From a paper:
Here, we report the crystal structure of the UbiD-like protein PA0254 of P. aeruginosa in two different crystal forms at 1.95 and 2.3 Å resolution, respectively. Manual inspection of crystal packing and analysis using the PISA server showed that PA0254 forms a dimer, with the subunits related by two-fold molecular symmetry.
The refined model of UbiD2 in the trigonal crystal form contains three polypeptide chains (residues -4–494 in chain A, 0–494 in chain B and -7–494 in chain C; residue numbers -7–0 are amino acids from the His6-tag that were disordered to various degrees in the crystal), three Mg2+ ions and 784 water molecules. In all three subunits in the asymmetric unit of the trigonal crystal form of PA0254 the initial electron density maps showed clear difference electron density for a metal center close to an open cleft at the domain interface. The nature of the bound metal ion cannot be determined unambiguously, but based on the ligand geometry, B-factor and electron density it was assigned as a Mg2+ ion. The B-factors of the bound Mg2+ ions (33 Å2) are very similar to those of surround protein residues (30–35 Å2). This assignment would also agree with the presence of 0.2 M MgCl2 in the crystallization buffer. The metal binding site is located adjacent to a deep cleft that extends across part of the enzyme surface and may represent the putative active site of the enzyme.
Author numbering:
A (entry chain B): 0 to 494
B (entry chain A): -4 to 494
The structure:
Amino acid sequence: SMNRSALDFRHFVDHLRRQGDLVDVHTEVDANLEIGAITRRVYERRAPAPLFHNIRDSLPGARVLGAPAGLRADRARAHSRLALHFGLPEHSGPRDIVAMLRAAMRAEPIAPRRLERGPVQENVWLGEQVDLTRFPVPLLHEQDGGRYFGTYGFHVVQTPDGSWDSWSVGRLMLVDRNTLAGPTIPTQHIGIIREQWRRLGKPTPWAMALGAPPAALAAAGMPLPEGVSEAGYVGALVGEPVEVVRTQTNGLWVPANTEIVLEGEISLDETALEGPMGEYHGYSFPIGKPQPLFHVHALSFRDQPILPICVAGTPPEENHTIWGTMISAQLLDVAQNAGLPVDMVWCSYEAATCWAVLSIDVQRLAALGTDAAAFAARVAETVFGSHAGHLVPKLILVGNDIDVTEIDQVVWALATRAHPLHDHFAFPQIRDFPMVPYLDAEDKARGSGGRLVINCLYPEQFAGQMRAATASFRHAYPTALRRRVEERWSDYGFG
Amino acid sequence: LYFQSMNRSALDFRHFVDHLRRQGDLVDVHTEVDANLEIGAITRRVYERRAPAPLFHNIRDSLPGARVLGAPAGLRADRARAHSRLALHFGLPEHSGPRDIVAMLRAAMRAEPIAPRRLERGPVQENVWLGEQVDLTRFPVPLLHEQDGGRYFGTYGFHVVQTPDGSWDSWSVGRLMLVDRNTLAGPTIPTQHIGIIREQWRRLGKPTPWAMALGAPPAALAAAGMPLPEGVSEAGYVGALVGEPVEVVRTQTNGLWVPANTEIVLEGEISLDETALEGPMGEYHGYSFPIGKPQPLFHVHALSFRDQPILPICVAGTPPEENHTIWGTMISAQLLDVAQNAGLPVDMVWCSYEAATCWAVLSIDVQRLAALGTDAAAFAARVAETVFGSHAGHLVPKLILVGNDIDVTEIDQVVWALATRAHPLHDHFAFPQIRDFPMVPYLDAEDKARGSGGRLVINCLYPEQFAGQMRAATASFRHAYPTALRRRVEERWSDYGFG
Ligand SMILES: [Mg+2]
Ligand SMILES: [Mg+2]
């Protein structure tokens, strides 16, 4: 059931209900602001994911699932919804998911299983039959530039010769009944492929899978080389291939179990103004930007289709829980592949992927014979120089007496270890990720200025010393007594 | 009737304990446990998991009937009631949070005191040991952390002393390490009120008459930590706090007045000439440093206790424990008074428990900020001077200045602002000349010799906010949806199916 949830969105949703992580909303809600407002609150209260059954003035049978990888208030199970995206059980935490991702990234892909048919074909609208406005397309935040059809799903394109099928995560704003608009980064795989079609004088055939198999959405964001197709890495993630059917109108292959598939082409030169919109950093910047038109020639969907939605903004939402976690997992590979004494990396969801905390193996630190400034520089070059680390402007270096995945502990280290005169290491020569929201006009002209390493390693730690013991349950009591207290917890009378 | 019980909980420790049990915020531990490390270790885990407070009923080698309560102002895992146990120390209900408590404390500091009510008897007098009968070691005196220099009798209560002429009764929070059967040791800082009074008795060639109240009325303990002028008695401020006076009885041996409901009262005197090594001990900053310090002996001449006496304990260290939940909160409230009395555009201050009282977050009213026509560097310096120069602000090395679109009492939102707003080249304002609080754990040897070096203001106000503008809206429930719709969602939450 847990691995089934990973390969099948509809089952994923039933599973949530069974484990008490789903609220069926049967009362009538408005896709104009209300769905988004509710879903946003859900993220912030860490509530069960809502399934809206009754949406004003929308395709009968159509439904919306809010917060598909939001967190849960119950701390023992807080990451369960996220974990299902990777076929992992209810009690899986950041470290379990990171270990699984790192392994997946070393595993072999498994060729997708081609099928003649599948549930996504249960309903088909062609050409003139296409009307996107009939779906419960939400206006997500009050000031958004338009309604968003696609906020949790991926694009599918292919090279003209068919040798490389490319999945990538993307978002699409509704323009009209059969047109959308959304970003295509020229240097991203989708942009590279779009260039190949352009030199033939052709628009790019496209599809978007919404309510895709959770692991297929995961796979779509995996860091893969140019030429390598994402579909196979569903098998790398969960040991079982994704099942695919051919689209109705353009010869692409989309997961068989997907809820809603849009089919069409990315326009050569037509654009619309897209945005403003909430983004991963928690802000909604006010200016719109022209983006390419995606023309929809056909759409297919399951009976009683579920449109999943993300309401991007202040954490934790899917940007942080899925993409942040993946970045964390990649940064740990980067650090360890470099030989750094790092046993964990965590891009705290609370920091909206604007910082990474590196857990430093203090038992191996003295052997480096270094100090804070040199170590900060070394870690800066290594991490910021990587593809994943390019994305994160601030690194916090801290000894592994704390658990870097718990923000309260990071805060404690930050407040009590980082000396204001000696532990603030700015690296203004290092090129920035341009979306970092605190960048100013000079940083933007220069291309650098935003990068920072905050050191929380006390100077003595570079000699293997430590000025004071941590007065916590973990570090203030001998091993035997810790074990006794944990084994007797129930006997004492605690739940 | 929950409100009956809430009110009584503030004035009677024994009832407070019963209140927690009825709310499901107590665990009655009947398993036999060891005062040596085990009780501390369990209580420590309780803070960290935010579990119910444990009342230990069965303690190896202890006075018959003796009990221990751990985590008396620890937090609860239930977010909607997280601060309920703390709140009871201030006469406040289960859903009270940081802001409600700060408001009550600020109003308390300007309310009238109500003189204590003198009684001829109270339950603290139910058992009395005099002189040769005093044996502190019969109580369940914990060794709290593995590397403590001794067992601590007092980690949750206050000292009572009085001026020689009897015109000023002083309560103050303090810890006491066990030295032997009738002797303890702990700090008595000369510049603080207990030390000033001690100096008055010294001038007469006399030791200082003293009592310690343990398991005191929760709002008595709160009153004891209030920032009152010299010459002003803390006891009257139980009345300012909860609208009803504390009830007091005379000690058995030295003329001092102590709360009638206290679980355990020690009576004696503070030695003129004798010291012992006290500590080391876990401290509020989360650390146990290796070296103790000489402190004055407190000789116990008598003690009295309630039947089945409950000794409350604090296992100081990584937050949140009582140093943070009680005293951090009081510091936050005073810093807010400091900021406002100085006319800073600040609507809240919060010493985040998670930062172990090593930083204070200042919530900035951005419209009032624009009126000042200032900038980051000048505003940082102004806040630094004002805040670090105050009695309360002197204690806190780091300040965070941030717009009030976030709730500064929520560490997750503070972390978000900090990561997304503080520019590495422009917003790190160290104040290396401003005098440090010497306990700050990151200070180096040069800082300590010099007396300064560790102060910092972190600016999270974007440049445009100083002109009252903002580069981008906050994409949150609070700020991404209009008032009436948020209200609809809140009001219909249960109708949607949430439980
Ligand atoms: Mg790719
Ligand atoms: Mg005083």
